[PDB]
C-alpha cells in the first residue's frame, strides 16, 4: 500500500520508541528503590529529565536540515542514544554515571526524533493522498513500540534486573541501527540537501562538540532541579518578553499555554498516576496479575487503537477545547474513583485507571498530534525554540505538581494515601475544566484569527 | 510469583518461632510482604508485614511480640514471634504485593505462599 521505505522507517521508530519508552516506564520507580530517592525528589528529577528529552528536540531538525543530513543524523541519533541507554545499565555498577547517561538520552533523542518523521515525508510526492495514512500509521508505530516497552520493562527489570531491562533498550536501538543500514539502498535518493555532499567534518566536529557539552549540561540540571527551575523561570520570562516586543502571533502564544497545560497533565503517566495505579489500584485485571507500573501501557493502547478511528473521522480550536475536556475528565474520573469507589481497604479497581488512560489518551489524539502541525499554519524559528522552550517548563511544572501526590517511604496503609491521591487529582482535574470552558469561550475568537 | 514458607512449628506458651518467605523468580524487593494467619473456624487475617522500602504495619494483638525485617541479601523475609500465646496458633502465610503499600484483606495480594502450621501449647 506504501513506498518500500515506509516500512522501514516505520520498523526503526518503532525500535526506536521501544528502547526509549523501556526506560521511561522504569524511570521513577528505579529512583525510589535502586537510587534511594524520596518519591518528591524521583518527581521532579524525572520532570527535569522529561523537560531536556522535550526541549532539545529543537536541535535535531536544524543539524538534520543543515549541518549534516537527515540521513547522517539518524544513524547519529541512533549511535548516541544506543550509548546512552548502555550507560544506563552501566550505571548499577557505577551509580555516579547515572545523570551523565540520562543525559546521554536527552541528548541523542534530540539529535534523532525530528528525522525520521522528516525522512518519511521524502517518500511520497509531494500531493499524494496516501501523506495521511503513512503519518497515521508512524504514529501507531510510535505507540506500538511504546506499548510493547511499557508492558515488558517493568517485568523485564522484576525478573533479571534493570542492567538487562537498559541493555535490552540498546539493543532495540541497536537493531534499529542494524535495520536503517540494511534498507540505506531504499533511501538512496532520499534526504535532505547535506545528505548528497560529502560530510563536512567540521560540522561533524561541532556537533559532537556542542553533544557532549550538553551531556553535561544536563547532568547537571538534572542533579540540580533548583537552578534548571530559575535557568528556565528566567529564559522564560524573557522569551516573553521577546515574544510580547515583535495577531496570528497571539492565536499561537494562547494555543502554547494550552498546551503548556496539555504537558502538565501529559506528565502525570510516569510520576503521580504510576504510583497511585501501585499504591491504590488492585494488581488484577481479567483475572491475571499485572505488574502495576504496566499499567503505564494503557496510554499507546488506546492510542493504538484509537488513531485510526478517529482518522476516518471545529477544525483548529475545537479540536484543542475537545482535547483539553478529556484530559479534565481523566483526572476527573481518577479522584471520583478514589472519593466514591474504594475497597474498604483503600484499594479501587483497575477499571477506573482504565477509563483514565482512555480519556487521557483522546486529549492527547486531539492536541499533540495536532498542535504545531497548525501552529506550523499560523506562522517561525523564534517560535519553534519558544515552543520547545516553554513545552520543556511544562514538563518542570508537571514534576513539581507530581510531588503533591509523593508519599514517604514508611507509609504503608492505602486509605492514608488515597486522599491525597484524590484531592490532587480533584483539583487538577476541577482547574483543567475551568482551562477547556475558558478555550470554548476564546474558539469564535481564534477562528476568526485564523481566517 | 512463588513464595514458599518455612519455620513453623510446635512451641510451648512464651516461646519462639522465626517464619521466612523466599520467593523464585521475582525480586522480593519490589514486594510488600504482609504475613496472614488463619485459625481454626476464622478467616485469614491480617498480621504483619513490610513494605517495599522499611514501612512496616502490625496487628494490634501481635505489636511488642512480633518483629518483621527483610533481608535483602538473602531476598527474603522474616517474622520473629516471640512470647507466643495459645491464640497465635493457625496456619500462617505470607503474601506478597507490588510496592509500598500493606493492605489489610487478601484480596490485596496476589502472590500467596502455601502456609506453615503454628501450634502454641499451653
Known amino acids: 500500500q506504501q513506498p518500500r521505505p515506509f516500512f522501514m522507517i516505520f520498523f526503526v521508530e518503532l525500535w526506536e520508541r521501544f528502547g526509549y519508552y523501556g526506560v521511561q516506564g522504569v524511570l521513577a520507580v528505579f529512583f525510589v528503590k535502586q537510587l534511594g530517592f524520596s518519591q518528591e525528589q524521583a518527581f521532579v528529577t524525572f520532570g527535569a529529565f522529561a523537560a531536556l528529552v522535550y526541549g532539545l528536540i529543537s536541535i535535531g531538525g536544524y543539524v538534520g536540515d543543515h549541518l549534516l543530513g537527515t540521513k547522517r543524523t539518524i544513524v547519529l541519533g541512533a549511535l548516541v542514544l544506543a550509548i546512552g541507554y548502555f550507560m544506563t545499565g552501566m550505571s548499577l555498577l557505577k551509580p555516579d554515571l547515572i545523570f551523565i547517561a540520562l543525559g546521554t538520552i536527552a541528548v541523542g533523542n534530540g539529535l534523532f526524533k525530528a528525522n525520521p518523521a522528516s525522512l518519511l515525508s521524502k517518500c511520497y510526492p509531494p500531493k499524494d493522498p496516501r501523506l495521511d495514512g503513512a503519518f497515521t500509521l508512524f504514529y501507531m508505530s510510535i505507540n506500538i513500540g511504546s506499548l510493547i516497552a511499557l508492558s515488558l520493562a517493568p517485568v523485564i527489570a522484576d525478573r533479571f534486573g534493570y542492567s538487562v531491562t537498559y541493555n535490552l533498550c540498546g539493543a532495540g536501538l541497536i537493531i534499529a541501527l542494524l535495520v536503517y543500514i540494511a534498507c540505506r539502498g531504499m533511501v538512496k535518493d532520499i534526504g535532505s540537501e547535506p545528505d548528497f555532499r560529502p560530510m563536512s567534518f567540521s560540522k561533524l566536529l561541532y556537533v559532537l562538540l556542542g553533544s557532549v557539552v550538553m551531556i553535561f549540561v544536563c547532568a547537571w540540571l538534572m542533579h540540580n532541579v533548583e537552578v534548571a527551575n530559575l535557568v528556565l523561570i528566567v529564559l522564560s520570562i524573557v522569551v516573553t518578553i521577546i515574544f510580547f516586543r515583535q495577531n496570528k502571533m497571539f492565536v499561537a502564544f494562547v494555543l502554547m499555554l494550552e498546551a503548556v497545560v496539555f504537558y502538565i497533565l501529559y506528565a502525570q503517566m510516569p510520576t503521580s498516576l504510576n504510583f497511585f495505579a501501585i499504591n491504590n489500584v488492585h494488581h488484577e485485571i481479567l483475572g491475571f496479575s499485572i505488574n502495576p507500573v504496566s499499567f503505564q501501557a494503557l496510554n499507546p493502547f488506546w492510542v493504538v487503537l484509537a488513531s485510526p478511528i478517529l482518522a476516518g473521522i471545529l477544525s483548529m480550536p475545537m479540536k484543542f477545547t475537545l482535547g483539553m475536556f478529556m484530559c479534565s475528565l481523566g483526572f476527573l474520573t481518577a479522584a471520583a474513583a478514589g472519593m466514591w469507589f474504594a475497597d474498604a481497604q483503600g484499594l479501587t479497581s483497575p477499571w477506573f485507571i482504565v477509563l483514565v488512560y482512555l480519556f487521557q489518551s483522546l486529549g492527547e489524539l486531539f492536541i499533540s498530534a495536532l498542535g504545531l502541525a497548525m501552529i506550523a499554519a499560523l506562522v517561525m524559528g523564534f517560535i519553534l525554540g519558544m515552543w520547545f522552550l516553554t513545552q520543556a517548563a511544562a514538563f518542570l511544572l508537571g514534576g513539581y505538581v507530581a510531588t503533591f501526590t509523593a508519599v514517604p517511604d514508611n507509609i504503608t496503609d492505602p486509605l492514608e494515601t488515597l486522599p491525597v491521591y484524590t484531592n490532587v487529582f480533584g483539583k487538577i482535574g476541577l482547574v483543567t475544566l475551568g482551562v477547556a470552558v475558558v478555550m470554548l469561550l476564546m474558539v469564535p475568537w481564534l477562528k476568526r484569527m485564523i481566517a | 510469583v512463588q513464595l514458599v514458607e518455612s519455620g513453623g512449628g510446635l512451641v510451648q506458651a512464651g516461646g519462639s518461632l522465626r517464619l521466612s518467605c523466599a520467593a523464585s523468580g521475582p525480586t522480593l524487593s519490589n514486594y510488600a510482604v504482609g504475613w496472614f494467619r488463619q485459625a481454626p473456624g476464622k478467616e485469614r487475617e491480617f498480621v504483619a508485614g513490610?513494605?517495599?522500602?522499611?514501612?512496616?504495619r502490625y496487628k494490634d494483638v501481635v505489636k511488642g511480640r512480633f518483629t518483621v525485617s527483610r533481608d535483602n541479601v538473602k531476598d527474603t523475609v522474616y517474622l520473629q514471634m516471640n512470647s507466643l500465646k495459645p491464640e497465635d496458633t493457625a496456619v500462617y502465610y505470607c503474601?506478597?504485593?507490588?510496592?509500598?503499600?500493606?493492605?489489610?484483606?487478601?484480596?490485596?495480594?496476589?502472590?500467596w505462599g502455601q502456609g506453615t502450621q503454628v501450634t502454641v501449647s499451653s
Open positions: 513490610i513494605n517495599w522500602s522499611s514501612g512496616l
Open positions: 503474601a506478597a504485593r507490588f510496592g509500598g503499600m500493606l493492605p489489610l484483606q487478601p484480596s490485596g495480594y496476589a502472590n
